[PDB]
């Protein structure tokens, strides 16, 4: 039959549900559908518009001439309302608050877990995805991620900045991590400004393909990282190494080539595809009082760049500094080291100080005098500054903008005045380049960050004024995203989608770039309204302290105040993480649908059920707070597994999915409890990963098979850069499911480390001596792929060595289709030993006579009826072509792999290791005689064929 969907003529099968075909052609959300069971209408998300009204596509079978509207306004409204209803009951955090607090929004939890595991290069690799210069940020960043960490609700926020500094230093010293550069996109980008924003824009446009050219006035890169932040906070060799990490990606650096003095912005646009203005705010804002022209009045930024560049600045004993930003702190602690008595003046109170708080505390330790709630009025002196009159300030209620008191006459005799009121870019330069700005801050659209001149983007201190390194890097990354979007002509649709994607859902689905931009910039994060009472059960762990240089010796040298933490305390500090983010954040479909449909958590608010988490099982967690009640786990365990692990309990708003009253998941005697982790779509049933910190990583599945028994079930191994995380089930696998033995005992993730010689873990030299000295026979365990078997057989043939195996027999004339179609079976093997037979033989006649098919245990002889013979080796059907036969009864043996039948051998035996199963590539033959591919998750450390 043929149907019309959204006005386009389509051909669809008549028996299958419409949701399959529709999901093939368009985006149809839905939780509670799978082909294994009958259609379920428990989520109501697959709605379509039909002539009879709105109805669910999973229950719709195609009918002739049916018109389907998948994305009408009413359908979007209904799906958005349904998602908001579901989110009103959802409980959990998609990401940790550490990622939300970071202006770059970096995966803090993941690289903390990687630091706990000891893989510092991988932690730095995860850091690089959101921001550049992790060592610089580990030294200077104000640590916005620790402001709202969930460990603030227990004892103390995690040392994210210090652990990041340790990992970045380890990566800098022990071989830097450099990303992979995609092939050239043919576009060149010009960046004006060598600061953090320019470096971030250049790095993230280089990692996309476009070649980047950086224009910087000063001879060095870093901008105010080099000529701003003083060297006792950020050593310049560390900065050289970090900027080298950025620049080795292929960014051509043009220094002493300034915009407005060497090239013009019109010519810059004419000669380049796109331009980013990260020129910073290098001009210092004059305070605006009488007598500012007196000798001895200098600007804070000019003073700092004079000190950093290695020039002589004439500084007296008594210095007053005006400002409250980081600039005032750096000029204060730099003038203190030069031999002055420095005071800092600020209009507002201590808590409103934009400066980094730890730097304020350190300056208090070093002896910097702070004046808060005061401001200068005029600078008194004949020609040089001798005294400045201030007025005490008090900011009343309206913002609370400061307004001075009527009169106090704060007159202080001082030798130098240093102005650090703020920063801006020159208004004359901004006007002469035709770039609009207000008060020196460039005017741009908030989303696109694009100026009034087409092709020109801006960010950093130029746009945000008094910003930080991380905020400038975030603006630069956003500008790289927008420059890539503008280069492929998608900037306007992207702007509209980022404003509201629920109006352009088809365009979001159609273009992968819009999907990526939506999920990178505007993702739906579910948030938990937590307080101190929700973390009363965790064990208090102290935060590690790094010893600073002594304040008295600190106030007289330009040496680094804070060192990198010890390697011994790194694991202890990284194991205090509570893993607040959802373990299924990268796979949860509720999050994806709420991102696509612009669902709000606050739309419908009210009672939600609070469930305790069922972690009592050895390897499976059941969190009913994240349950959307699709019933797929219940349908599996009661229809296919036929184990009855869990079921619906109670009805209405109080419904949940639990084992039974009075028992938890540990007491259940099922062998398919680990399949429910792949069954659940919204992270309610999850798997306990064996690592110390399982912090979710964007893993990649690899197609391989299991080696638990001769079934050799196809499965996906989830890998995160050579980490073997977990085993999952593929939809395109003939079995479709894997058993708990394979998942949790992990026969694919273990082997024997050393060759075995009568229970002795001898080295390979002794094993080679044993092999060469004696003419042992070659015995093969069935845990080797077909290529390994062929290689060993060919070696034995050309070297004239008898060849054998731990198992002998023949048969297996039954295919999977025969087991499916036959009605009567003969059961001799123990069912519990082979768990897939539970699913394959469900609802079939088990008889002793007249059987159509039989299951027998190796060694066995094939019968006239289609027979299944089950060995205990994955490639035990490797004898169907090689004819490797059994033990040839020789003197001493070399056997590749460990089997219980080794004890049956007569004489001393050398057990060669068969290698790690997950590291092998080849084809295997299972019981049903189908050739299944095995692929490597990681690189093979040692090879069996080369032994």
């Amino acid at each position: 039959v043929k149907i019309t969907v959204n006005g386009k003529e389509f051909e669809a099968p008549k028996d299958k549900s419409l949701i399959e075909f529709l999901r093939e052609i368009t985006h149809v959300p839905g939780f509670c559908y799978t082909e294994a069971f009958d259609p379920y209408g428990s989520c109501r998300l697959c709605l379509v518009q039909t002539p009879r009204g709105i109805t669910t596509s999973c229950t719709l079978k195609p009918m002739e001439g049916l018109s389907i509207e998948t994305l009408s306004d009413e359908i979007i409204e209904m799906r958005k309302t349904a998602l908001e209803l579901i989110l009103s009951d959802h409980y959990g955090d998609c990401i940790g608050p550490c990622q939300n607090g970071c202006p770059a929004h970096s995966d803090v939890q993941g690289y903390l877990a990687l630091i706990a595991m000891g893989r510092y290069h991988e932690a730095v690799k995860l850091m690089k995805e959101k921001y550049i210069l992790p060592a610089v940020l580990g030294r200077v960043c104000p640590a916005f991620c620790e402001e709202e960490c969930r460990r603030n609700l227990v004892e103390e926020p995690l040392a994210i900045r210090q652990l990041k500094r340790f990992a970045a230093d380890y990566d800098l010293e022990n071989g830097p991590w450099m990303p992979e550069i995609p092939p050239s996109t043919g576009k060149r980008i010009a960046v004006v400004g060598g600061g953090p924003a320019g470096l971030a824009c250049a790095y993230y446009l280089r990692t996309m393909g476009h070649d980047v050219t950086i224009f910087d006035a000063m001879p060095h890169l870093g901008g105010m990282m080099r000529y701003g932040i003083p060297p006792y906070r950020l050593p310049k060799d560390v900065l050289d190494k970090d900027i080298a990490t950025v620049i080795n990606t292929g960014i051509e650096v043009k220094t002493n080539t300034a915009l407005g003095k060497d090239i013009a912005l019109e010519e810059l646009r004419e000669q380049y595809d796109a331009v980013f203005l990260g020129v910073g705010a290098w001009k210092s804002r004059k305070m605006g009082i009488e007598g500012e022209d007196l000798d001895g009045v200098i600007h804070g930024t000019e003073f700092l760049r004079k000190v950093n560049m290695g020039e002589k600045v004439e500084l007296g004993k008594r210095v007053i500094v005006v400002g409250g930003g980081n600039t005032a702190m750096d000029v204060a602690r730099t003038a203190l080291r030069l031999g002055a008595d420095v005071t800092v003046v600020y209009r507002r109170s201590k808590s409103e100080m934009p400066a980094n708080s730890r730097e304020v505390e350190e300056a208090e330790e070093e002896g910097v005098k702070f004046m808060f709630l005061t401001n200068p009025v005029k600078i008194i002196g004949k020609e040089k500054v001798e005294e400045v009159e201030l007025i005490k300030m008090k900011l009343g209620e309206p913002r609370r903008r400061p307004m001075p008191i009527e009169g106090s006459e704060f007159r202080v005799k001082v030798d130098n005045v240093i102005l650090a009121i703020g920063q801006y870019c020159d208004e004359e330069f901004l006007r002469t380049i035709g770039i609009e700005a207000k008060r020196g801050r460039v005017l741009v659209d908030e989303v696109t960050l694009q100026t009034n001149k087409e092709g020109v983007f801006a960010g950093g201190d130029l746009v945000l004024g008094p910003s930080t390194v991380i905020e400038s890097i975030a603006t630069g990354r956003r500008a790289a995203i927008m420059i890539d979007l503008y280069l492929k002509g998608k900037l306007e649709k992207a702007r509209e989608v980022l404003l509201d994607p629920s109006k352009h859902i088809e365009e979001v689905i159609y273009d992968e770039d819009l999907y990526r931009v939506l999920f990178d910039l505007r993702p739906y994060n579910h948030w938990k309204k937590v307080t101190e009472k929700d973390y009363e059960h965790v064990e208090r762990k102290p935060r590690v302290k790094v010893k600073l240089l002594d304040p008295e010796i600190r106030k007289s040298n330009f040496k680094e105040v804070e060192p990198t933490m010890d390697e011994e305390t790194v694991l202890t500090e990284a194991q205090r993480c509570m893993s607040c983010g959802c373990m299924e954040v990268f796979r949860c479909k509720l999050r994806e649908y709420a991102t696509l449909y612009d669902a709000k958590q606050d739309a419908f608010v009210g009672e939600q059920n609070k469930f305790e988490i069922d972690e009592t099982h050895p390897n499976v967690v059941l969190d009913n707070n994240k349950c959307v009640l699709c019933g797929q786990c219940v349908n599996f365990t009661h229809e296919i597994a036929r184990e009855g692990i869990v079921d619906y309990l109670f009805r209405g708003f109080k419904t949940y999915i639990g084992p039974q009253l009075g028992e938890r998941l540990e007491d259940q005697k099922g062998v398919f409890i680990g399949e429910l982790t792949d069954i659940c779509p919204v992270g309610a049933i999850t798997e306990k990963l064996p690592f110390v910190k399982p912090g979710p990583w964007k893993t990649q599945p690899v197609k391989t098979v299991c080696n638990g028994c001769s079934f050799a079930c196809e499965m996906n191994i989830e890998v995160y850069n050579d980490i073997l995380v977990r085993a999952s089930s593929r939809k395109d696998s003939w079995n479709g499911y894997i058993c708990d033995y394979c998942r949790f005992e992990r026969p694919w993730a273990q082997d024997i480390a050393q060759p075995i010689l009568k229970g002795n873990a001898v080295s390979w030299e002794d094993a080679e001596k044993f092999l060469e000295e004696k003419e042992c026979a070659l015995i093969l365990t069935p845990s080797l792929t077909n290529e390994e078997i062929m290689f060993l057989k060919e070696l034995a043939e050309r070297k004239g060595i008898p060849i054998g195996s731990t198992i002998d027999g023949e048969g297996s004339t039954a295919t999977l289709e025969d087991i499916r179609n036959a009605k009567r079976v003969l059961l001799k093997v123990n069912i519990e030993k082979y768990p897939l037979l539970k699913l394959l033989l469900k609802g079939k006649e088990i008889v002793e006579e007249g059987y159509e098919v039989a299951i027998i245990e190796g060694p066995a002889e094939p019968m006239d009826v289609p027979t299944l013979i089950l060995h205990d080796g994955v490639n035990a059907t490797g004898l169907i072509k090689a004819g490797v036969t059994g033990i040839p009864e020789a003197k001493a043996y070399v056997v590749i792999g460990n089997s219980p039948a080794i004890s049956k051998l007569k004489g001393e035996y050398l057990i060669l290791p068969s290698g790690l199963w997950a590291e092998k590539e080849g084809t295997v033959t299972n019981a049903f005689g189908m050739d299944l591919k095995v692929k490597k998750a990681r690189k093979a450390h040692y090879d069996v064929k080369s032994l």
Binding site: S42, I54, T59, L85, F604, F653
Partner: protein, 590 residues
């Protein structure tokens, strides 16, 4: 002629009123004054507002007495069966025969516009005796249908316009035709007696008063369809109905109407009474099938209809008790007589449960296509205290409120469906000027929230959200944004639910918004016009009219002078304004 029988209505309504005591008193009086007069029990006649009912039966007239407590049984015995004088004060119903028909005179005019088709034998025959049902013309339709071909019976039912009395109004003949045409060999038929409406008891009344009518309808339907087993899905909360069904089944089995070779036609059919544990959702046919199979009653997507895949896969026909009870009348009097009643698109008669603030409440058998105001004012007698009726809600807790100015609407499927309500169970709850409509909507939404199975997201979640919004409005903590959210959400919950419970869930809110938005807007201002919402009102005592009750604050949990009321810590319960002397407690706002 001479008085042959004394009868008392012994349905659940009669027992609740005290018909057991009346029955025992009559038996004792017949023993004490030695009289050989038969004493049988009958069903509920229909006048539920005058129970218990005692019948004096002669060969030509039946004189029914209302409100017959045990104290007045001696007087009626002495005056009527000993001396021979009707007590015209207590005669609430007189029944005589004219040319083979039954003529009824009612004191209150209850029966003037009533046409009893389903309930014609209720209150006149013994439900526990198959001989009386046989003598009253029963089971003759069974023999006539056995002399007909099953296809002819299906066409017979189709031509009558007998739409589904279960609430949705599906053509029953089409349902039987589908079930018979369904590919298979072993078929089942189910009587749907899971009457989940707390205010409707019509189907239970049919199962109690006239169970053989339901049994005969089921046997006719089974012969038409080709069924071999029959299931009567009735709640175990209905014990009297189950007992009478069991005794009627055994009596029909011993008289050759159930079992092997029913009336020598080569037809075998047994009826099994399946008992449900009690849920409003398992009255839905798919949840009924799931509960009979031993699962939990979660409704499934219906396009695989129960006629095609019902009980254990095999085809199943599921009809209401009233639908089965109309079938013998159709086979007996022909489809011409059933097509002679009702409107064009809604034939026959409908059984309505009149409740609420109505005067002549009970189960009315009225023709379809009747003006609503006739049922409300002549049959129902208007309101109890003469107050003007503000609205009526039809369909039970899943129905809609039809306002007073639409009482000219004919009562039929299409008219009530288009007005905003639904037929539902068949209950009319009368709401007057004293009734706050927002509280009524909250009551029905609370019942829907309680009775949801919790399968689909829209019902389970949106019904709870709608109830939260209604409780926010009722406590006065609402705004126009909440009304906007309700006006958005209610159509979405109606459109996006899976079973009829959630699809009919937003009906009360929708109809109250469409007709009574005045109280919706007024509850935003912290004022309840009907003065029944507890947080939006208080209770004050006026000194100008109060007296020395000395129990005004004592009867209420909370000397010769107007007492005090702690409005700060009052419960706003209301056990002062009803138990009051003179008129001393006005309500007013808080």
């Amino acid at each position: 002629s001479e008085i042959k029988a004394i009868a008392v209505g012994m349905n659940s309504c009669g027992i609740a009123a005290g018909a057991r005591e009346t029955y025992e008193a009559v038996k004792e009086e017949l023993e004490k004054r030695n009289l050989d007069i038969k004493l049988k029990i009958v069903g509920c006649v229909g006048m539920c507002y005058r129970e218990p009912l005692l019948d004096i039966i002669t060969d030509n007239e039946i004189i029914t007495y209302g409100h017959v407590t045990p104290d007045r049984v001696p007087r009626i015995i002495e005056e009527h069966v000993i001396n021979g004088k009707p007590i015209e004060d207590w005669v609430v119903k007189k029944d005589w025969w004219e040319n083979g028909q039954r003529k009824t005179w009612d004191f209150d005019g209850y029966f003037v516009k009533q046409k009893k088709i389903v309930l014609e034998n209720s209150g006149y025959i013994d439900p526990e005796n198959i001989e009386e049902y046989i003598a009253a013309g029963g089971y003759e339709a069974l023999k006539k249908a056995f002399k007909m071909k099953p296809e002819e019976i299906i066409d017979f039912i189709t031509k009558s316009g007998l739409r589904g009395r279960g609430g949705a109004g599906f053509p029953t003949g089409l349902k039987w035709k589908f079930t018979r045409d369904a590919p298979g060999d072993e078929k089942y038929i189910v009587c749907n007696a899971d009457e989940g409406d707390p205010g409707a008891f019509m189907d239970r009344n049919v199962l109690e008063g006239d169970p053989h009518r339901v049994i005969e309808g089921m046997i006719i339907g089974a012969y038409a369809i080709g069924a071999t087993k029959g299931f009567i899905y009735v709640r175990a909360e209905y014990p009297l109905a189950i007992k009478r069904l069991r005794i009627a089944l055994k009596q029909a089995r011993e008289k050759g109407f159930l079992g092997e070779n029913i009336l020598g036609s080569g037809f075998s059919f047994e009826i099994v009474i399946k008992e449900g544990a009690g849920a409003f959702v398992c009255g839905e046919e798919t949840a009924l099938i799931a509960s009979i199979e031993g699962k939990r009653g979660m409704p499934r997507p219906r396009p695989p209809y129960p006629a095609q895949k019902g009980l254990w896969g095999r085809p199943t026909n599921i009809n209401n008790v009233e639908t089965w009870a109309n079938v013998p009348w159709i086979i007996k009097h022909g489809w011409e007589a059933y097509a002679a009643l009702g409107t064009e698109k809604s034939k026959g008669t409908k059984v309505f449960a009149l409740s609420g603030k109505i005067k002549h409440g009970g189960n009315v058998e009225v023709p379809m296509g009747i003006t609503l105001r006739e049922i409300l004012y002549e049959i129902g007698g208007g309101t109890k205290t003469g107050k003007k009726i503000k609205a009526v809600q039809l369909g039970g807790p899943s129905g809609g409120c039809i306002p007073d100015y639409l009482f000219n609407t004919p009562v039929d499927y299409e008219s009530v469906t288009a007005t905003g309500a639904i037929m539902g169970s068949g209950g009319m709850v009368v709401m007057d000027e004293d009734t706050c409509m927002v509280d009524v909507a909250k009551f029905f939404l609370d019942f829907t929230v309680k009775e949801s199975c919790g399968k689909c997201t829209f019902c389970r979640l949106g019904t709870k959200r709608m109830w939260e919004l209604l409780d926010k409005i009722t406590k006065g903590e609402g705004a126009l944004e909440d009304i906007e959210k309700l006006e958005k959400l209610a159509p979405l919950v109606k459109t996006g639910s899976l079973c009829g419970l959630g699809q009919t869930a937003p009906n009360p809110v929708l109809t109250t918004l469409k007709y009574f938005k005045d109280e919706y807007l007024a509850h935003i201002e912290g004022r309840c016009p009907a003065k029944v919402c507890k947080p939006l009102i208080k209770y004050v005592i006026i000194t100008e009219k109060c007296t020395g009750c000395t129990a005004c604050a004592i009867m209420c949990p909370v000397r010769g002078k107007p007492h005090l009321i702690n409005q700060e810590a009052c419960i706003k319960c209301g056990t002062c304004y009803e138990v009051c002397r003179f008129n001393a407690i006005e309500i007013t706002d808080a």
